[PDB]
Design a protein around this ligand. Sequence first.
Ligand code: CL
Length: 104
Amino acid sequence: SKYVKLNVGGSLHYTTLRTLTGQDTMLKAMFSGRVEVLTDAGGWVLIDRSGRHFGTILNYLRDGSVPLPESTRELGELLGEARYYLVQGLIEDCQLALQQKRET
Ligand SMILES: [Cl-]
């Protein structure tokens, strides 16, 4: 029940530590002391990424699955972040959803 507050490109998020370390992701690396992380005076963990889909990322780490968006752009936007945070399961789902739109 240890909590964490993240500032993802101006997007403010509150989440638990277990969620951030529940899967083998780059976020798990941050909150286990394997990579240098920057924090402001407010105690917010700063991340230089768009937080547009970050809530969706947290849902995947938390629940293990999430309903994906419909448009090819948003799937692309989500896929980009899933790749940045190294969330293997979500990247695959986004890839399958994208190839399904290509058919056709
Ligand atoms: Cl579309």
